[PDB]
Structure 1
Amino acid sequence: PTINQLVRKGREKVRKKSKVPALKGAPFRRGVCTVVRTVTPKKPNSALRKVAKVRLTSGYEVTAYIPGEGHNLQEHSVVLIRGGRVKDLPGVRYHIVRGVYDAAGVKDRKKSRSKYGTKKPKEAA
């Protein structure tokens, strides 16, 4: 780099590739869906996890899962692509609202209702 080699060039900034090729800032994008599959986190697991094929309101399939056990959809749902890789499904990424036009957490959870649906369990009686 020695003063001169420095003066001539100017060391390329950074340029990021981002972890969400959902494009046009889509941490909420359409999700139309189909298929189901299963796979496994690397080696020691086994489960299910859907595959929401989306098409966004722009394009393309991806693998969209949800929170957890207990689905609700049949098709459509407008599942809003979210965005987070976990220890498998080479990509994982872009989970689902759970609420919108389908899903809504499940029916039995006492915590993450802030996205696992269920307004207020409210003992009521």
Structure 2
Amino acid sequence: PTINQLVRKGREKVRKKSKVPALKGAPFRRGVCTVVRTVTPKKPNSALRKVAKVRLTSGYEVTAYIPGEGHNLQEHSVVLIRGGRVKDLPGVRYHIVRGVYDAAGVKDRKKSRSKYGTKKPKEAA
């Protein structure tokens, strides 16, 4: 645009928006579970993928994802949420954190033990 135009109108700043209302920025948020359905994904995939709907301390009610092998969660379970999309599951924008509250660690987990939330074992250790 002409300078005069730039002097009249300016450039407009680019403001992209949050990919995750866990509201107040908050790196995590507290949930109480509501439903613990099982979800089929999309695209070129198939498997029965574990999910929860969660009432938030934000006032939000949202679908989050239970990662790991097996779980211990049901209608009143009470979870922490960290946010983290799934990708195969449209509308699933958050993750349940394994190892806080009534969400269990992950039994017999040896490799990525820090995620999945599972204390160090005592076999030959």
TM class by smaller structure: 0.7 to 0.9
Matched residues in 1 for 2:77 and 2:28: separation? 12
- CA distance change for structure 1 residues 52 and 118 in 2, over 3 Å: closer, same or farther? same
TM-fit CA distance, 1:124: 4.9
Matched residues in 1 for 2:57 and 2:68: separation? 25
Q: How many residues align?
A: 125
TM-score by length of 2: 0.83
In percent, how many aligned pairs have the same letter?
100
Any conservation in 1 of the 2:106–2:118 contact (CA below 8 Å)? yes
Any unmatched runs of 5+ in structure 2? none
- CA distance change for structure 1 residues 60 and 48 in 2, over 3 Å: closer, same or farther? farther
SS at match of 1:91: coil
Any unmatched runs of 5+ in structure 1? none
Any conservation in 1 of the 2:80–2:101 contact (CA below 8 Å)? no
TM-fit CA distance, 1:38: 2.9
User: Which has a greater percent of strand?
Assistant: 2
TM-fit CA distance, 1:99: 1.1
Matched residues in 2 for 1:52 and 1:90: separation? 14
Any conservation in 2 of the 1:40–1:46 contact (CA below 8 Å)? yes
- CA distance change for structure 1 residues 39 and 60 in 2, over 3 Å: closer, same or farther? same
Any conservation in 2 of the 1:35–1:52 contact (CA below 8 Å)? yes
Deviates more, 1:57-66 or 1:38-47: 38-47
Matched residues in 2 for 1:73 and 1:38: separation? 12
Any conservation in 2 of the 1:34–1:53 contact (CA below 8 Å)? yes
- CA distance change for structure 1 residues 49 and 105 in 2, over 3 Å: closer, same or farther? farther
Q: Deviations over 1:74-118 (max 9, x none)?
A: 344432221122222223222112111222332122122112122
TM-score by length of 1: 0.83
- CA distance change for structure 1 residues 39 and 52 in 2, over 3 Å: closer, same or farther? closer
- Please report the RMSD computed on the Cα atoms of aligned residues, expressed in angstroms: 2.1
Any conservation in 1 of the 2:80–2:96 contact (CA below 8 Å)? yes
SS at match of 1:67: coil
Question: Equivalent residue for 1:111?
Answer: 111
TM-fit CA distance, 1:36: 2.7
